[PDB]
Amino acid sequence: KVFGRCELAAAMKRHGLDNYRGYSLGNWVCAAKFESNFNTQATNRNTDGSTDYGILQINSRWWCNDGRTPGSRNLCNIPCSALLSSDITASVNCAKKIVSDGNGMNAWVAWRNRCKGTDVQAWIRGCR
Numbered sequence: 001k002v003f004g005r006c007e008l009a010a011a012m013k014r015h016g017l018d019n020y021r022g023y024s025l026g027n028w029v030c031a032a033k034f035e036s037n038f039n040t041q042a043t044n045r046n047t048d049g050s051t052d053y054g055i056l057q058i059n060s061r062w063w064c065n066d067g068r069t070p071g072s073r074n075l076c077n078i079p080c081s082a083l084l085s086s087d088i089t090a091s092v093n094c095a096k097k098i099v100s101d102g103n104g105m106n107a108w109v110a111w112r113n114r115c116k117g118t119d120v121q122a123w124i125r126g127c128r
Helices: 005-014 025-036 080-084 089-098 109-114 120-124
Strands: 043-045 051-053
Touching: 005 025, 005 120, 025 109, 025 120, 051 080, 080 089
Parallel strands: none
Antiparallel strands: 043 051
């Protein structure tokens, strides 16, 4: 599924992300936009053989199991395919664990390079 901007904001708010560990809703929508273009089915392969999955592009090297990344951890305790669902619950719950591990949202390269230090509130402007 490809979410709308305001549609995704409302979904993320319901799931407890607004100000989670100090990050306003605008940060999370901005990261989804540049990581996946709001598409739950997005995948991308990395140099080291790991793969990124879904709306927030979560990495098989540490967070989920996809059966083809030798020596990797499964810290969110899920198959990577569950992260591509039209229901964003599994992605949200896994992301909550990632942003809590000490490095905040710096774990998402596109947030660091394209959202951080910008007017992120603009990403939720106009939404009910």
